[PDB]
Amino acid sequence: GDVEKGKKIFVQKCAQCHTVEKGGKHKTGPNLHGLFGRKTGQAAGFSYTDANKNKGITWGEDTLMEYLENPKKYIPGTKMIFAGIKKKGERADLIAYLKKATNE
Numbered sequence: 850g851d852v853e854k855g856k857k858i859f860v861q862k863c864a865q866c867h868t869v870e871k872g873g874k875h876k877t878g879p880n881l882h883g884l885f886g887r888k889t890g891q892a893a894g895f896s897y898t899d900a901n902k903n904k905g906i907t908w909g910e911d912t913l914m915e916y917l918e919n920p921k922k923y924i925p926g927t928k929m930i931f932a933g934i935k936k937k938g939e940r941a942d943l944i945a946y947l948k949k950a951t952n953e
């Protein structure tokens with residue numbers, strides 16, 4: 850994926866609710882640093898729904914591709930209010946950005 854393009858997607862669709870940096874603050878949504886390889890609902894210090902805590906998958910390219918297409922379908926009852934990104938290339942670019950940003 851294209852990290853530069855992914856950053857712009859993130860800014861447009863995600864950044865209002867999420868930070869990515871190490872030590873970044875929780876906002877409407879949890880800080881996303883360290884997500885890759887982590888189970889759902891594991892950012893420290895954030896009140897997740899039980900739905901997000903219980904989903905139990907490991908975040909990575911495959912699961913992010915599916916989630917980000919339609920978040921509430923993947924985690925019904927989530928309090929993340931975002932309808933999804935339909936396009937596969939846009940999700941891949943966003944996920945490439947996330948892989949860099951959330952592991953710096």
Ligand code: HEC
Pocket residue numbers: 859862863864865866867877878879884888889890891892896897898900901902917926927928929930931934
């Ligand atoms: C606010 C209006 C949000 C927007 C826009 C996006 N997200 Fe979000 N996200 C938000 C909340 C409140 C939560 C917690 C949901 C709950 O039910 O507890 C989330 C969660 C995520 C997660 C899961 C994190 C984890 O399991 O630790 C991911 C991976 C995530 N959000 C990513 C994400 C991306 C990439 C977004 C733009 C496409 C995005 N979110 C938008 C709130 C909001």
